[PDB]
Amino acid sequence: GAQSSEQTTLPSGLQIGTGVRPVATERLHSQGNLSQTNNSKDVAIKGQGFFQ
Amino acid sequence: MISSLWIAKTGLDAQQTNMDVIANNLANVSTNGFKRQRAVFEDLLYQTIRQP
Amino acid sequence: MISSLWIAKTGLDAQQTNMDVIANNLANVSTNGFKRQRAVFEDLLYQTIRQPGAQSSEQTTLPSGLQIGTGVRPVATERLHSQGNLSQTNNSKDVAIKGQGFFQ
Amino acid sequence: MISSLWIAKTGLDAQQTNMDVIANNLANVSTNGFKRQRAVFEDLLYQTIRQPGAQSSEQTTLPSGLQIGTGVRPVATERLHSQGNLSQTNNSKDVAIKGQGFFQVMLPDGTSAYTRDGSFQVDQNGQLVTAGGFQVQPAITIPANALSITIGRDGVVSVTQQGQAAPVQVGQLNLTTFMNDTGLESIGENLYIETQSSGAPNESTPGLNGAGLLYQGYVETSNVNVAEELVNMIQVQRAYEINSKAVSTTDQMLQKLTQL
Amino acid sequence: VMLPDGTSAYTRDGSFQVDQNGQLVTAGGFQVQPAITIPANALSITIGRDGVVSVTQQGQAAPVQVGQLNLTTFMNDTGLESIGENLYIETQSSGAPNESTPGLNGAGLLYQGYVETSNVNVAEELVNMIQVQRAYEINSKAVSTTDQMLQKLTQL
Amino acid sequence: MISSLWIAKTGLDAQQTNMDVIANNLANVSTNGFKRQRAVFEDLLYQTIRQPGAQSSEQTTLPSGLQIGTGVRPVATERLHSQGNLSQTNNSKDVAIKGQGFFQVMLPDGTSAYTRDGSFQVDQNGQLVTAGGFQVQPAITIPANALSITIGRDGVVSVTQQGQAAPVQVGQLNLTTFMNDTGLESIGENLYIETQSSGAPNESTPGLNGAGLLYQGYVETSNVNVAEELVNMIQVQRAYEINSKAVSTTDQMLQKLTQL
Amino acid sequence: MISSLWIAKTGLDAQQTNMDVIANNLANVSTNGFKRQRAVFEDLLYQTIRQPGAQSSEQTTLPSGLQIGTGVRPVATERLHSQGNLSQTNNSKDVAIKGQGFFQVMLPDGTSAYTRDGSFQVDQNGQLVTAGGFQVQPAITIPANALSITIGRDGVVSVTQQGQAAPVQVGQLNLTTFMNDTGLESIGENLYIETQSSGAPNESTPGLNGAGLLYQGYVETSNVNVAEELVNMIQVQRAYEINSKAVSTTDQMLQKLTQL
Amino acid sequence: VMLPDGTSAYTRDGSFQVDQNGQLVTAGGFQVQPAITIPANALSITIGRDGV
Amino acid sequence: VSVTQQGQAAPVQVGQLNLTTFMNDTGLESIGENLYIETQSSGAPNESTPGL
Amino acid sequence: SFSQAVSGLNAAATNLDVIGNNIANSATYGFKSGTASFADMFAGSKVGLG
Amino acid sequence: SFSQAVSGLNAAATNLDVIGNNIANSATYGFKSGTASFADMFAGSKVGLG
């Protein structure tokens, strides 16, 4: 964008870039398929809650 | 490991429950004052990839 | 990391979704009042390269340019709301539907 | 920096394009009304050096002089607009084309697109829309409590109401035909838009002017034939491998130049 | 094939497409000579053994002849100038382009639904690459030997 | 990319065509008035190399020169026009042909197709129609007050009204015959249309100069033979597998060469 | 640039030609009236260097001196003109040959070609033609109202008309025999033409001095033996392996000389 | 190509860009004559065989 | 040199390619453009039909 | 060539459905049997669709 | 051996069809029973064709 001449501008100048970095590791909080273990004590959640 | 495998395993277990019910019904033909069983099934969870 | 690999990855995912639909249909054979599912797919975006119909010379157009396409995506899962076979259980409480209504 | 390297690079790019087309064809096996793609290749420029036909002697000519060619580039991608095999889905809302016509739908922008896919639904308003929700043209609206929908071979859509012994007509499903079907621009979502190379949209009923016939309860599957795709994958892999070998040979030549 | 500037080129790539006004053209858009215009009411296009193009319209039980595919035969084929995009132009070594019907005057036949592929033999090219590479490595060594001889000579 | 690959890529396609013909024949094993298909193949190009019969010396000729050939192409699938077995399903509206003639039916667009299917119905207006709703020719109307329909061996359709001891003639059914029955173009729905290779439609009465005979209460079944189709599947499968093995051998040969 | 590399290249080309012949033979398995081809090779030139039989010493000669051979080249591909097994297609127009004769057809150019395939049809005018539409000579004209066509063992074509207990003869099918049957030039399309190495076409009746007997309802399938083709494919693959290894070994030797 | 002083030079480097007021310019920013101005709502720019 | 003409089951004889043999081939003068000219040490160019 | 055979399988299933329905109504006053009729789906000749 | 066996299969099928036609016409006045005659199809004398 710098003025290359008195009446013109420089389009898309010289950008030399460095490498790549990892930003973040995100989890996919979705509903997994249910498995029945025939146990009176095992509980499964259907929506978007957590046990405390 | 795969959603299809879990669904098919669940279907297998349900049909095995139906077979067990049928076998128990057949085993008690000569019992007096017996009421035969019938199993009722339902659809499991439905993941909403794209909301209808 | 390369275009063909992404296209094939999308195809694999679509076929896996189809297999899940088939497995769900199989698991609910004994359920009462169940309507089977069917998955519908659509073809994904297109990399344009040469535009189809672009004027090459002053008078001659370019027919059917280089439309390199991407993979596939499933649009929807539709139920088949059709009257299933009625079974006689001879029970005073069991009710069956003959038309296209729903219980509330 | 060396000619053979650029030529083999162009060859590698062409083979990668062929593999891309192959993968796109393979990923769309289950897509309804999909047409397979084919790539067309052409020679690149030709360095002239000696002019073929130049005057070598006063009474002799130079036959077929030294023309040095550049690599290869794809000309264009052409579809195979042919009738795909029909599949019975036993659904009153699915229509299949037997000839060479297209359904006209309206995009949300107001412009019209064309699709050969017949998987239709009915929205909350009753208008016949596609699987993505685009409204067919015209708005084949549907009454409230329909019992059955009958779409004839000539596009007449009728609804059977209760207590009425005669079916009522609620629309007329028409087909659009083009001078050049390969010139339609694919935009995804099984949708083709008009271009200047696809002629003009000729609106017509099913059965006249060439337009195809409509079958209710059937869907037009893709025309992709797998065995051709497998043999072409073998071809693409081996040609890519040969071109990579040529690149490697050029690399060794240049390295030997560097050592001296 | 008729080029935009009006001069005729010649091609053997038989992949054709119908443009927006009918008309058979090459994949690059150049119109093929002579003229075949295919109407809208066409159901199937058949190109015969002798280049006759017939178009079947609905209702008619007899196909309608549209055009003739004329093959241009040269007497010295290799003398043509390759102008790039799968096209050859005539030169002084391939003069007198003879229009003919396919199958007559030595011309070839036409098979519809098939395309002639490249005649490049692959093993020959790989062995030739081996020969070329080793040859460029023996000439480079000759260069190095001459350089060393010169260095030894001019050093004294 | 190599010659044997193209040749074995034509072999695969020809065997796939043979399997398609077999599967289509087996799928329509029960449709009435069906004629099964047979695919025919022919040799492709033959590269001359050394010309056969070339004059090597001034007195010795070269016998059977180096004629390297290309793959195979199918000419066409021809319909095996034979008389299917007649079945007595005892309905007055089913008629079967005994010779080599065809029924003429008027298509909605005004043109005439030709069908050998004899399962006829009566529309709401009383005309004889094909089960697909196409009206037969030269139009045979049936009154509402009809007690019995009698179609004789000569195609005369008679209707007996109530309390009347004499039948009433309501038309005359005629059969169309062609010079070449194979050249007819099948348009589906058990319908064939005339093509220039099928000559011209010669209308004739059933028993004269070559039209067949009509039997009432009979249906003409298909001529497809299941056991022969099974054996042909077993042989086509083996041929396809062997050609695929040729493809694989070519692929392996190209691997070692490139690796070198 | 080095002799062993040229020799191994010639070997590779010969093995590729053998594989091409094998693939062509396997691609035409379903073709009727097809004859399998076999290629024959000859070794290339022999460098003289030391003339054998020369005087090794005043009283002795050199036994079997130093001859250095070049690669290999294919001489010719010979057909195997043998009777393939007959197949019953139960068609009145299919004709098979039991002996050593050929059918004669006329190309559109006016010249005469020869074909052994007997899958015949009838055109729109009534003449007996092949599957490619070429008219079988001598012209056999089938009339409009034919009921059955009978072709006997000696080549007489008879038509039985309606109401006439005697059959009407409408032609005479002859067979052409050549002294050298393998010398014919195959143009594809199951057609062979006469060359100067195939002698002259001798017309003869089918049953006379060596023309074969004509069977109606039979087709002569190809004589390709497939297990032999699989074994030969194994052989060709291994030979190509060994030749490629020779090329690679020569490549490794020249490398050490470059390094020198 | 139009130099800053106003005289016309000539180039064979075919790597062109477009600047912020439309207009085709070279990699250095000099504007190419004749003056070709690509609009903003462009979806795809095609440069034909004959320079159209 | 024989050629095949359409419809002609026989080839048409066009010409004979004669080979020239010298006595001392090593004495020829190599003039450049892959050509040898006769030199007094390689005289007597004898034309012959190849094979004879 | 998979859809072609799938269509034949569906036709055979429909025939067997009709036969089973007819058999189940062997003793049912006022019942009239059913019969399924089939027609091919040729597209442009030389190829079948089922 | 897949063309020599197919011929025998077809011959046996023809014989069985003839036998079935004889059985079906057990009660048909003026009917004459039918029989099938088979002959080999040798070629050279070392190559049988079925």
Numbering used by the authors:
A (entry chain 3): 53 to 104
B (entry chain ZE): 1 to 52
C (entry chain 9): 1 to 104
D (entry chain 4), F (entry chain ZA), G (entry chain 5): 1 to 260
E (entry chain z): 105 to 260
H (entry chain t): 105 to 156
I (entry chain u): 157 to 208
J (entry chain ZF), K (entry chain ZG): 2 to 51
How does the study describe this entry?
The bacterial flagellar motor is a huge bidirectional rotary nanomachine that drives rotation of the flagellum for bacterial motility. The cytoplasmic C ring of the flagellar motor functions as the switch complex for the rotational direction switching from counterclockwise to clockwise. The basal body is made up of the LP ring, MS ring, C ring, rod and export apparatus. Here, we present two high-resolution cryo-electron microscopy structures of the C ring-containing flagellar basal body–hook complex from Salmonella Typhimurium, which are in the default counterclockwise state and in a constitutively active CheY mutant-induced clockwise state, respectively.
